[PDB]
Amino acid sequence: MVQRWLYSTNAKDIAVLYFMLAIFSGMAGTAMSLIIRLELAAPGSQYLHGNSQLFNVLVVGHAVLMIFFLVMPALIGGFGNYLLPLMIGATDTAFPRINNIAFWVLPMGLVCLVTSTLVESGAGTGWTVYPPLSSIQAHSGPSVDLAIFALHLTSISSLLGAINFIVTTLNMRTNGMTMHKLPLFVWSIFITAFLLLLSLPVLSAGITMLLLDRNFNTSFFEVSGGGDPILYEHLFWFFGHPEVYILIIPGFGIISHVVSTYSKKPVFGEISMVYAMASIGLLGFLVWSHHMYIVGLDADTRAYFTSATMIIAIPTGIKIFSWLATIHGGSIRLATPMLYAIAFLFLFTMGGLTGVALANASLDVAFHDTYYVVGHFHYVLSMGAIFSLFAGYYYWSPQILGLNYNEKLAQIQFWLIFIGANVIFFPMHFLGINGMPRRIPDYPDAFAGWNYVASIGSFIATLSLFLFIYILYDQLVNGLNNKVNNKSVIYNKAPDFVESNTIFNLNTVKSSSIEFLLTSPPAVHSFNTPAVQS
Amino acid sequence: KPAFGPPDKVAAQKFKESLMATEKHAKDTSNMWVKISVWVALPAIALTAVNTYFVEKEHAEHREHLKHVPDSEWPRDYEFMNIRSKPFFWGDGDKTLFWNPVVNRHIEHD
Amino acid sequence: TFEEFTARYEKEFDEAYDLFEVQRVLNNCFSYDLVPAPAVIEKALRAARRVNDLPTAIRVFEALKYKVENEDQYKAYLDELKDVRQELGVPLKEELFP
Amino acid sequence: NKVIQLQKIFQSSTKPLWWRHPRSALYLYPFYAIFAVAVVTPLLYIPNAIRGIKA
Amino acid sequence: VVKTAQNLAEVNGPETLIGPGAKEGTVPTDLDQETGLARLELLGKLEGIDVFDTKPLDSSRKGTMKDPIIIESYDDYRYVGCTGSPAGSHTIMWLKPTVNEVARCWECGSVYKLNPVGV
Amino acid sequence: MTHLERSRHQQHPFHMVMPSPWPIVVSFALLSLALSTALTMHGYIGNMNMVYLALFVLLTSSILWFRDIVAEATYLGDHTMAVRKGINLGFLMFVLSEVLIFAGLFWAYFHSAMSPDVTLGACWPPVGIEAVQPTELPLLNTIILLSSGATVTYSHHALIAGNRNKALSGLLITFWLIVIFVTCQYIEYTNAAFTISDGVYGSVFYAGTGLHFLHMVMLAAMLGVNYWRMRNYHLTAGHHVGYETTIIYTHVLDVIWLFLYVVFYWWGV
Amino acid sequence: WVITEGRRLIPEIFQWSAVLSVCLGWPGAVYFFSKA
Ligand code: HEA
Ligand code: HEA
Ligand SMILES: [Ca+2]
Ligand SMILES: [Cu+2]
Ligand SMILES: [Zn+2]
């Protein structure tokens, strides 16, 4: 009905809408990656005739669709909207009517982005829209103007969503849930919302400065007029480095919850975990210019930014070890979410070691703007944030939807995506150390070796995505039959050693959150009488 | 059936007296700010408005003197003075939102 | 301490009024890092007889066999517990062949 | 003032909140007429801009 | 015909809560122009009553099968969180006491029987 | 209270709002504004009659959103004590974001001021710009804004005290003392020698004060809806959230002006 | 403790060296099989 979906006020329906928009944009953005790989498979322009445009435009579309339209609406708008009220114990959000406008301004941004792509110019500027190239003299069409308007819409959506989560967490908790006793996912969402609140306005200021400079004649970054194109870099990256932490902090809560349910032992040192999670968010505001090492800064500020960025590894490492200490003694259940979590623990540590290798300003003069950095951030994004998204889906979907998903057909998808992504993103570090630059459509012949191998691996991941789509179809259709036959696994916690099969069937869920105690699917009005803790 | 327990009767007379205490504190502190307004704010505005009024008329005669004689033409513009990368869309090609033809000219020295 | 540990589960097992509590206490006794003393195990056997559950008494040694970690120490527990086990009637898993 | 008699009207109305006040018909009907022109006219110029003809 | 409640016991839903409006030339008070759930809360404050319950559940006892801890709810179920007799002894285990069923707290052993007052 | 009566009421203090069409109507009005503005900037329409239409629909829809909020707080009465704390907390988190927008504008000023560019003069302000004189006219605005914070304070406490002639008079002076700020700022803009197109100096100058100028016009509108609601007996003596958020807004907006008076006027000449 | 730990530890180091050599050393196979 129109009223239920066009006039939505229920938070769960808004979460479903966020999910539904994320998959469509996810499929749209992962086909541009396929075309990019097909264009980079061999030297020479093979598929796109000679157009260097429509290559940069495709890269911009891919990056924006993957970041601002898949991970943001799924981790924050999809999981955050559906699960934070339930684990806290609130019936819905504090501002239920702006929660709808936090979503409905996203489809308008898609229209602005598509119509920007369809205008004769296009926006071939990168996701970092630097002023002098995206000025009015070099990009003379209305294309990047429409691209900027999409960023404003996403920013306003994220800001209004972030204000909602801070007030919801602070004064809508149940009768026993002191701020000291919270689930870790809620803590991650809280810290992420606080980072967004303090980081978005600076991006808005810089982006509006760029718009006014292109159309209102303000020497904001115009060289002829005293403007500085490097001020834009400061303004943008002040939102940029903290941003790489909005996309991973809610990814930490998912892993924290997954590894302590299929390993039947609670997390080792939770208070240190929340301390480390807050320290990464707080201290990420002091390291933004490591993205600006070679721009010509002073020698002494480079030393400061080199010393401050390595401190990031102290709390981060604490999270890596404390994850390896909560699985040491317990009993391990190797299911699909556990396989995703175990893969995450390895691939994210492989990404972080390369990251600390990049943190030294004296060495970054050899690894900047190469495929080395691409290989780096594709480990923490395509293997660090995507994997926790798959793990979260396989973790909560049977509880949310009420439909099981044929385990053995999902482990095949896991192995395919594992060995497909490792093929794409491991050879990149070899291309980067020989000096292969970024953002080029065609490369010298000597680089043709690992590029072919990486192009072969993209088809494996695309096949895994197609298999995942089929898994979705087989879950929605005849998914009620999956828990009748022996295709799926019903219980996420096996009985203990001295626990009989007839006593496990009176205490089925031994969980530390309200999420798994609710009916499947959860009711529209979940909490009439408030729940009591401790 | 009683639902709630026996009335506290101690939270009451501590909630009903704070309201009386609150309105009493707002009653006299309001009188303090009225005294500040009349005896500080009002004289301050009167002593700066009469000063601004006199200086403003001194500027006004200067502004109308500009129109009388172009004479030696308007001062030349530095390389950063008038920026016309893309003409304005609202009306003519080169006029900003607030334009005072008396003081803003934009003459082109070709 | 170990003696404090043994003397406090010797009291927990003596107060277990159902089959849910007996299987809850024994899951706590074997959840600790230390392997329990043979005095502890004897009281656990008495509890199973009190709540009338043969299969939990069988799982006591099965829990011990994986817990004791030594092939001779399992025999050490075996020898001292011969009298109580034979008197009760608990069969080992290998003898039972299930 | 009128708040008491306005309270009795808004409550016990069984109508959408923007239709409860008796004077609401004056705002809503002219709004949807102007609103339609506002969100449909810019959509007509999209194909004209894709071709490149400037009006 | 209908008069404002003037007390928490005379409340008969919403119509009684409505109040007498402020006289012309005076600043309205809350006892004059409150109308709904905000007024019902205000009526409770004037007495020694909190209309919304925020008290956690007791840790005084353990609670056995023959002496369960009674949890009072307006529905056919509720959610309770156990941490032990000294609050915080173990990790929280969420339970769902319902009508015709009691939660057992596999870690600690506490028992809860729902008390269904309502409807 | 009987057990039967208590079950005929909410068991929680939070407010459940009915489905509404304004979150999406505003969303569609923001696309028309975004899509019409992108066209008129480069032609493709011909005149700026569609931009005005988009702004009118954007404003009118927002008015009908606020029209619903006052109805459910004054006639249906869904703002319990817990709901009132969230609204105050939400506004405090909204003014912090507003401050950080200004913090990005002070950063843009200090970047070109501490080390002035070479295409400019070696100095700051650039060569040939007649900057606004801090003592003649802006000083009148400084005294006016401070006096606004003193007359809204006793208007707030007079409302608590219980007399409506002093409360109503405090807002009336407050509104007209803010309009004088807007008209006096209008006079200076139309009498200034330099424009927004005058290099980098005009960009940072008119972006800091211009953003404040656009915020003062929205302050007068907020003050105007509190005079209608006070005159028609909406605001009570112990429950006025639409007025508390207005007093915080005008006090915060005076601190921002004092900061803009020290660095853009005094320190920049 | 030397007798018990030996039966389990030392075989795993050999299995350890195999898997890690696969995840990290796979591109060596492609280069040798036919760098061509
Ligand atoms: C989720 C996304 C994400 C995450 C989590 C990170 C995490 C880190 N990143 Fe970065 N990064 C990006 C996304 C991310 N990054 C993106 C997208 C870019 C490119 C943007 C662009 O230019 O287009 C980028 C670019 C980037 C640069 C700029 C490179 C350049 O442009 O030249 C630098 C510089 O130092 C950097 C460093 C780090 C460091 C030190 C961490 C640390 O957080 C990592 C810490 C991890 C570890 C320390 C390993 C785990 C810990 C242990 C195993 C314990 C033991 C550790 C020790 C003993 C040290 N990455
Ligand atoms: C979330 C962010 C994200 C994701 C998922 C990806 C995924 C992929 N990307 Fe990358 N990429 C970026 C962010 C991302 N990328 C950014 C920011 C840049 C920089 C752009 C610039 O330089 O301006 C970039 C640039 C970039 C380049 C370099 C372009 C250049 O510098 O010129 C290449 C080269 O091959 C590439 C390829 C791929 C491939 C083959 C995949 C995938 O095939 C990898 C496998 C992953 C999937 C197939 C997705 C599976 C999941 C879903 C589809 C969602 C549904 C699932 C759930 C809801 C659980 N993208
Ligand atoms: Ca090619
Ligand atoms: Cu960074
Ligand atoms: Zn317990």
Residue of A8, A157, A370, A382 marked active site = A157
Euclidean distance between CA atoms A192 and A242, whole angstroms: 10
User: Mutating which of D9, D10, D21, D50 best tests the F interface, going by the most F Cβ atoms within 10 A?
Assistant: D10
Together in a domain, F31 and F148: no
CB contact under 8 A, C27 and A503: no
Are A147 and A116 within 8 A, CB to CB?
yes
Q: Interface partners of B (3+ CB pairs, < 8 Å)?
A: A, E, F
Residue of A8, A125, A316, A370 marked active site = A316
Are F237 and F229 within 8 A, CB to CB?
no
Show the DSSP H helices in C1-98 as ranges. 2-14, 19-29, 38-51, 54-68, 71-80, 82-88, 93-96
Together in a domain, F64 and F103: no
The residue out of F48, F78, F108 marking a domain boundary is F78
Q: Which pairing describes strands E93-95 and E80-82: parallel, antiparallel, or unpaired? A: antiparallel
Euclidean distance between CA atoms A93 and A163, whole angstroms: 11
Neighbours of A312 (CB within 10 A): 20
CB contact under 8 A, A215 and B86: yes
Nearest CA among A43, A125, A118, A19 for reference residue A455? A43
- Per-position DSSP letters for E68-89, written without gaps between them: PEEEEESSSB--EEE--SSTTS
CB contact under 8 A, E21 and D8: no
Q: Phi first, then psi: what are they for E70, rounded to 5°?
A: -85, 125
Which ligand does the CA of A242 lie closest to?
A: 4
DSSP element (H, E) containing E114: strand E112-116
Q: Can you tell me which atom of ligand 2 is nearest the CA of A389? A: 59
Q: Name the residue range of residue F40's domain.
A: 1-78
What's this structure's resolution in Å? 2.6
Euclidean distance between CA atoms F236 and F259, whole angstroms: 35
Euclidean distance between CA atoms F169 and F175, whole angstroms: 10
Euclidean distance between CA atoms A338 and A407, whole angstroms: 12
Residue A496 Cα, gap to closest chain C Cα (Å)? 8
CB contact under 8 A, F16 and A142: no
Number of folded domains that form chain F:
2
Query: What architecture is domain A1-517?
Result: Up-down Bundle (1.20)
Show the DSSP H helices in F47-137 as ranges. 49-74, 81-114
Q: How many Cβ pairs within 8 Å bridge chains B and F? A: 112
CB contact under 8 A, C59 and A503: no
Euclidean distance between CA atoms C51 and C58, whole angstroms: 14
Nearest CA among F244, A168, A8, F16 for reference residue E36? F16
Together in a domain, F187 and F233: yes
D50 at A interface, C-beta within 8 A: yes
Mutate-to-test residue for ligand 2 from A33, A69, A405, A458, highest number of ligand atoms within 8 A of CB: A33
Euclidean distance between CA atoms A266 and A270, whole angstroms: 9
Are F3 and E117 within 8 A, CB to CB?
yes
**Residue corresponding to tokens 């972006």:** F207
Please give the residue of chain B at the shortest CA–CA distance from A217.
Answer: B83
Euclidean distance between CA atoms B27 and F162, whole angstroms: 8
CB contact under 8 A, A222 and B88: no
Are F33 and F59 within 8 A, CB to CB?
no
Together in a domain, F154 and F167: yes
Q: Which pairing describes strands E80-82 and A532-533: parallel, antiparallel, or unpaired? A: parallel
Specify the long-range contacts of residues B1-7, CB closer than 8 Å, at least 24 apart.
Answer: B1/F2, B1/F3, B1/F4, B2/F1, B2/F2, B2/F3, B3/F1, B3/F2, B3/F3, B3/F5, B3/F6, B4/E49, B4/E50, B4/E51, B4/F1, B6/E48, B7/E47, B7/E48, B7/E49
Show the DSSP H helices in B1-110 as ranges. 16-36, 42-68
Together in a domain, F115 and F203: yes
Q: Can you tell me which atom of ligand 1 is nearest the CA of A316? A: 51
**Cβ of A359 below 6 Å from ligand 1:** yes
Please give the residue of chain E at the shortest CA–CA distance from B17.
Answer: E46
A245 classed as catalytic: yes
Residue of A18, A82, A187, A245 marked active site = A245
CA-based R_g, chain E, Å: 21
Neighbours of A460 (CB within 10 A): 18
Euclidean distance between CA atoms A123 and B37, whole angstroms: 57
Together in a domain, F118 and F131: yes
Domain boundaries, chain A: 1-517
Euclidean distance between CA atoms A105 and A152, whole angstroms: 10
Euclidean distance between CA atoms B78 and C49, whole angstroms: 103
Nearest CA among A185, A160, A194, A180 for reference residue A85? A185
The residue out of F12, F47, F78 marking a domain boundary is F78
Nearest CA among E61, E60, E63, E58 for reference residue E102? E63
Q: Which amino acids of A are annotated as binding site for Cu cation, given as ranges?
A: 241, 290-291
The residue out of F78, F93, F119 marking a domain boundary is F78
A364 classed as catalytic: no
Together in a domain, F20 and F138: no
**Cβ of A302 below 6 Å from ligand 1:** no
A291 classed as catalytic: yes
Category of A102 on φ-ψ map: left (φ > 0), alpha (ψ -120 to 50) or beta: alpha
A256 classed as catalytic: yes
Residue E116: DSSP 8-state: E
Together in a domain, F104 and F157: yes
Residue G21 Cα, gap to closest chain A Cα (Å)? 14
CB contact under 8 A, B10 and E48: yes
Q: Phi first, then psi: what are they for A328, rounded to 5°?
A: -65, -45
Please give the residue of chain F at the shortest CA–CA distance from A162.
Answer: F93
Q: Is the peptide bond before F125 cis (omega within 30 degrees of 0)?
A: yes
Residue A380: exposure state from Cβ atoms within 10 A (0-12, 13-18, ≥19):
buried
Q: Dihedral of the CA atoms A415, A417, A420, A423 (nearest 10)?
A: -90
Are A215 and F37 within 8 A, CB to CB?
no
Mutate-to-test residue for ligand 2 from A23, A65, A382, highest number of ligand atoms within 8 A of CB: A382
CA distances from A221 to A202, A212, D45 (A): 16, 10, 32
Instruction: Using an 8 Å CB-CB cutoff, list residues of chain C that contact chain A.
Output: 19-20, 23, 26-27, 30, 55-56, 59, 63
**Cβ of A389 below 6 Å from ligand 1:** no
Euclidean distance between CA atoms E66 and E61, whole angstroms: 13
Q: Which residues of C touch E63 (CB under 8 A)?
A: none
Nearest CA among C89, C97, C40 for reference residue C63? C40
